[PDB]
Design a protein around this ligand. Structure first.
Ligand SMILES: CCCCCCCCCCCCCCCCCCCC(=O)O[C@H](COC(=O)CCCCCCCCCCCCCC)COP(=O)(O)OCCN
Ligand SMILES: CCC/C=C/C/C=C/CCCCCCCC(=O)O[C@H](COC(=O)CCCCCCCCCCCCCC)COP(=O)(O)OCCN
Ligand SMILES: CCCCCCCCCCCCCCCC(=O)OC[C@H](COP(=O)(O)O)OC(=O)CCCCCCCCCCCCCCC
Ligand SMILES: CCCCCCCCCCCCCCCC(=O)OC[C@H](COP(=O)(O)O)OC(=O)CCCCCCCCCCCCCCC
Lengths: 397, 59, 220, 316
């Protein structure tokens, strides 16, 4: 009965009796569709059928209008300017839009808790199989292990996964909405401020710079919002990883943590090499593109003289030597970084198992081993991304 | 030219002819429906001045 | 003569009120499978030959769930076929039911795929096949469960019971996904009659009159 | 009044695979497979080793097991290295060289009516961007798609080795996965294109306003120009909102597919246990892979999107 009532709440549309683009379904979606994002199914169908155009998109939800957001942030910005000796736009934006980021922090806390519950259910299921077999081999005394516990651990893995997913994507929903709010509001405030900006001020600050305020800086605040929750949910997601992994492996976990930490600087060094060499490749590309641009703009005279052969030779020299040597070099460093990403998640576990085996008298059993692989997989991400988070944070500052 | 002011056909034609814009508008592939290129490189300097005068007058 | 090795014979009604296992597998589910073969092959042929291309109904979570759940029912029937014990493999009713129902499931999968594009009404032989399957499997579940409760033993093992329970759930779900879902369509006169756009279950429960029953309750 | 979506241009994929020497493509796929086989064999060896440590109350003969485990892991790492080197040196570089050569020969040999017909920008763009994309992005995306496709094939293979009835679970989920992947593969591209289309008008209107700032204030058209700016924004956000909740939609469905895979792997492994033929190692191995499967499903879907994005460059 309760399942039926739940279905009759969830699934049924509510009927209604007797050129613009339609209102957004996020406003007409019950909490279950807001959780499973199943209000996007209509637009997912339309785009699969036909090439979408700006008329196919549903209008924005209730509180996404740039007017409303700009006024909402402007009230607080004026309060900051008239209230504080040292007004801070950061706290203005925080007052306005931090409610959703606290809610997203709550969902991220839950998601980290469940993400690190999953290895614990794995350890428990392996330990349960071990005990269950160790009893049945004795049989082939009272209150021996039930097989039910295996199925209930399996179903708890499913429940953890499902609730994990629901909370995670409400975290993403809220942080990405907050990024959209911050951009939709600072863009309108930048515009309305320029419309009252003094001529001498607007001459001192170039028009290129002023439009970069809206084209770049606001994009970097928006990109901050996606990452801001990791300023604590990276440390949290590492602390509970280290605790789980310590209670699992002992102090032999520290070998793995050390390996990941020290591969972080090498990773960042190679990342710098990668971006440097990509930019160099782009400038060789610009060189070859200049060659092509002159060839094409001069094509008439070029074909008249039949000089297209030597100019083809020049273009191909530029490409084959400069651009292709650079690109092969980039490929080799791509190989090095691919090797690193393949080996380091291996090497961390192999080395920590070595240190475990030689330090502890315990048996390196299955339930210690495979939860350790899972936990090292979970630990890689926060260590791998704290650099990008702090980079984003200083850029946003 | 309208620059946000509601279109009245008679006054718009009067302003187009008063600015003497008609001759320069006839050269446009779509006349008054011709889009001026990005950054305004699709029109002459004096013609752009006349267009600004047209906007001011139609206001 | 006697194709069944169960002591509780082909007698349609067992000592308990239920249908015997021989009856469920031998006539209910076996005739359901033969009904699907015989008539779903016919409908499949006709739906292919009627038109080269479909009416452009929008492929949906409903068609993908019908195809997934039909494949899932194939999975459960295959697992049940393997769960046959050496004793039950001598039960021609059981083995024939499983072979025939696998063949009917393949026909039903093809018929879902074609039907969805080619027919406005949810197809009749599909609906009745899933209503005979949800009932043969629900009466097999009842049979297994009654035998457990009185004779103390599962006649297919507790895994056979579990597979039967999942077959009940799966077939009920497929039956609902045939019956209830409207088929969507992608991009002053009075409208065409719903008796023409009503699947056999709405033609039976006269539930195509519900719209006009609402309109008249609301307005004159 | 609208343009129907089109099936994929597989001939383009085969022309790219002919650009890269298809023997070298076969080698590159081979070393993806060897990399993944050595990875999964490293974990199988780890399963065996841990079972040994488990039956014997303490770790026997450790150096041998640890050395073989390390050997298998390094085999996977070197297979990945050789894989990427083959991809770049032999496949992608050869294809970029061949395609640029072919296009230059053709463009130069074209009659002047071609240059007259088409704008010069539309040729310079293909010689710059559509060549840069096949230079770098396309090779990388094919790497990240085949690595992950092979990874999913092998996680499914290892889970099905543990409990072969998992194939019956993965086939229905295969149908759902393909449906979700197809819907996302198209609407994600559409919505991402619409976001990129509607983004520029904000800044273009802003430069225009900064140029005409004094005139706007003069006619006191400030409120109308502000409203135009806000319409530019709200249009961009109405194209961006779907572009992000598209990812949320997708990722939710794929994480249900992953959770159901974990449930299927775990429950079928426990059924095997009840049958008495399960060891803790099999469940540990199977289920570790089942826990990893969801992010690799997401990688595959997003790399199908990126491959489709970058292959129109080979088309052009
Ligand atoms: C608006 C409100 C109404 C709308 C509802 C519409 C649809 C109606 C659905 C509800 C149907 C009600 C069915 C009543 C439940 C029957 C419960 C039977 C329990 C029972 O009899 O006890 C045990 C039966 O054994 C057993 O194990 C038998 C198990 C199965 C019993 C067979 C019942 C068949 C009918 C139920 C299926 C209906 C589903 C319809 C889709 C015997 O115990 P013991 O004491 O004798 O043990 C002594 C051992 N020596
Ligand atoms: C629950 C888990 C399920 C697990 C499944 C295992 C998955 C394994 C991987 C499969 C996942 C992706 C499946 C792809 C689906 C698909 O193809 O659907 C395609 C789209 O596929 C793609 O866009 C990318 C495919 C890439 C194929 C590469 C071919 C060789 C290229 C050669 C170049 C190589 C050299 C590089 C150096 C659309 O089709 P349809 O439009 O016609 O649509 C026709 C409909 N009318
Ligand atoms: C522990 C036991 C609990 C009992 C059951 C718990 C399940 C929780 C029920 C929540 C209902 C889900 C909310 C969905 C809301 C909604 O659909 O809302 C209907 C939506 C339309 O969006 P709207 O919410 O705006 O109306 O439907 C769609 O257009 C697309 C459907 C979503 C696409 C995903 C497809 C999933 C397929 C399901 C498999 C079917 C198998 C069934 C037999 C097994
Ligand atoms: C033995 C076990 C078998 C398993 C289940 C067997 C049931 C058989 C299923 C047949 C489906 C019925 C056909 C209806 C088709 C249809 O609705 O079609 C949908 C119709 C619309 O008409 P159309 O058929 O043209 O689409 O819905 C309506 O507009 C009105 C609904 C009918 C009014 C009657 C209300 C009945 C309420 C049901 C009670 C809900 C309780 C659920 C929890 C217990």
């Amino acid at each position: 009965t309760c399942a039926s009532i739940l279905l009759l709440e969830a699934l049924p549309k509510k009927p209604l009796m007797p050129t613009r683009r339609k209102p957004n379904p996020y406003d007409s979606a019950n909490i279950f569709s807001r959780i499973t994002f199943s209000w996007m199914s209509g637009l997912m169908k339309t785009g699969y059928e036909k090439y979408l155009v700006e008329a196919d998109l549903y209008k924005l939800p209730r509180n996404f209008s740039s007017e409303e957001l700009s006024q909402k942030l402007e009230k607080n910005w004026e309060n900051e300017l008239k209230q504080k000796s040292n007004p801070s736009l950061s706290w203005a934006i925080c007052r306005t839009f931090g409610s959703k980021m606290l809610l997203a922090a709550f969902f991220k806390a839950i998601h980290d808790v469940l993400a690190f519950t999953q290895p614990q259910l794995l350890r428990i299921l392996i330990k349960f199989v071990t005990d269950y077999n160790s009893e049945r081999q004795d049989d082939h005394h009272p209150q021996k292990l039930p097989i039910v516990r295996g199925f209930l651990i399996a179903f708890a893995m499913f429940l953890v996964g499902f609730t994990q997913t629901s909370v995670l994507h409400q975290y993403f929903l809220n942080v990405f909405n907050t990024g959209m709010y911050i951009k939709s509001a600072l863009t309108a405030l930048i515009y309305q401020k320029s419309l009252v900006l003094s001529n001498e001020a607007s001459g001192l600050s170039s028009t290129g710079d002023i439009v970069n305020l809206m084209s770049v800086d606001v994009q970097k605040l928006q990109d901050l919002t996606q990452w801001l929750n990791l300023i604590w949910s990276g440390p949290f997601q590492i602390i509970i990883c280290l605790y789980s992994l310590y209670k699992l492996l002992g102090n032999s976990m520290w070998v793995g943590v050390i390996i990941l930490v020290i591969m972080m600087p090498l990773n960042s060094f190679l990342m710098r090499i990668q971006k440097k060499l990509q930019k160099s490749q782009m400038k060789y590309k610009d060189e070859r593109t200049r060659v092509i641009s002159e060839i094409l703009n001069n094509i008439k005279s070029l074909k008249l003289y039949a000089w297209e052969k030597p100019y083809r030779e020049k273009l191909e020299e530029v490409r084959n030597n400069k651009e292709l040597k650079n690109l092969t070099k980039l490929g080799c460093y791509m190989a090095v970084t691919s090797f690193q990403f393949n080996i380091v998640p291996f090497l961390v576990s192999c080395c920590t198992f070595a240190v475990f085996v030689y330090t502890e008298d315990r048996a390196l059993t299955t339930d210690l081993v495979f939860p350790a692989l899972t936990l090292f997989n979970l630990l890689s991400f926060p260590l791998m991304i704290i650099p990008m988070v702090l980079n984003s944070f200083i850029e946003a500052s | 030219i309208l620059f946000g002011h509601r279109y009245d056909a008679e006054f718009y034609e009067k302003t187009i002819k008063a600015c003497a814009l008609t001759i320069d508008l006839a050269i446009l592939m779509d006349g008054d429906k011709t889009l001026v290129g990005e950054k305004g490189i699709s029109l002459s300097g004096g013609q752009k001045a006349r267009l600004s005068l047209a906007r001011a007058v139609y206001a | 003569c006697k194709l069944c090795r169960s002591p509780e014979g082909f007698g349609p009604i067992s000592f308990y009120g239920d249908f015997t296992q021989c009856f469920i597998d031998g006539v209910i589910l076996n005739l359901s499978a033969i009904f699907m073969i015989t008539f779903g092959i016919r409908d499949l042929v006709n739906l292919c030959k009627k038109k080269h291309s479909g009416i452009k109904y929008r492929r949906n979570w409903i068609i993908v769930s019908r195809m997934a759940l039909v494949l899932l029912e194939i999975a459960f029937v295959s697992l049940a076929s393997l769960n046959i014990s050496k004793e039950e493999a001598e039960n021609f009713t059981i083995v024939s039911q499983y072979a025939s129902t696998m063949l009917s499931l393949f026909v039903a999968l093809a018929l879902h795929w074609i039907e969805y594009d080619r027919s406005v009404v949810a197809n009749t032989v599909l609906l009745f096949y899933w209503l005979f399957e949800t009932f043969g499997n629900f009466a097999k579940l009842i049979n297994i469960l009654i035998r457990h409760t009185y004779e103390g033993i599962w006649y297919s093992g507790q895994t056979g019971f579990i597979l039967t329970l999942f077959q009940v759930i799966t077939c009920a779900s497929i039956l609902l996904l045939e019956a209830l879902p409207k088929k969507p369509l992608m991009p002053t006169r009075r409208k065409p009659n719903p008796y023409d756009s009503a699947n056999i279950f709405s033609r039976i429960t006269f539930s195509w009159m519900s719209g006009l029953m609402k309109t008249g309750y609301e307005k004159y | 009044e609208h343009r129907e979506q089109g099936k994929v241009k597989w001939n383009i994929y085969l022309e790219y695979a002919k650009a890269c020497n298809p023997k070298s493509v076969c080698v590159f796929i081979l070393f993806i497979v060897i990399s993944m086989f050595l990875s999964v064999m490293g974990n199988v060896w780890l399963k065996h080793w841990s079972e040994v440590n488990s039956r014997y109350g303490s770790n026997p003969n450790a150096a041998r097991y640890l050395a073989i485990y390390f050997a298998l892991g390094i085999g996977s790492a070197l297979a990945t290295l050789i894989q990427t080197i083959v991809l770049w040196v032999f496949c992608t570089i050869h294809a970029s060289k061949y395609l640029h050569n072919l296009m230059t020969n053709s463009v130069l040999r074209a009659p002047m009516t071609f240059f007259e017909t088409t704008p010069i920008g539309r040729i310079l763009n293909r010689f710059s961007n559509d060549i840069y994309k096949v230079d770098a992005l396309l090779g990388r995306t094919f790497s990240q798609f085949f690595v992950n496709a092979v990874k999913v094939t092998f996680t499914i293979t290892v889970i099905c080795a543990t409990t072969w009835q998992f194939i019956f679970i993965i086939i229905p989920l295969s149908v759902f996965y393909i449906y979700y992947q197809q819907y996302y593969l198209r609407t994600s591209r559409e919505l991402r294109r619409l976001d990129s289309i509607t983004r520029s008008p904000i800044y273009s209107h802003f430069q225009e306003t900064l140029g005409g700032l004094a005139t706007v204030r003069g006619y006191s058209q400030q409120k109308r120009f502000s409203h135009i700016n806000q319409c530019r924004i709200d249009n961009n956000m109405s194209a961006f909102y779907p572009s992000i909740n598209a990812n949320r939609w997708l990722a939710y469905r794929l994480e249900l597919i992953g959770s159901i895979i974990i449930l299927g792997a775990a429950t079928l492994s426990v059924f095997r246990l009840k049958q008495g033929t399960l060891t803790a190692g099999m469940v540990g191995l199977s289920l570790s892979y089942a826990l990893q499967i969801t992010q690799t499903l997401n990688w595959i879907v997003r790399m199908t999107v990126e491959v489709e994005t970058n292959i129109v460059s080979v088309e052009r």
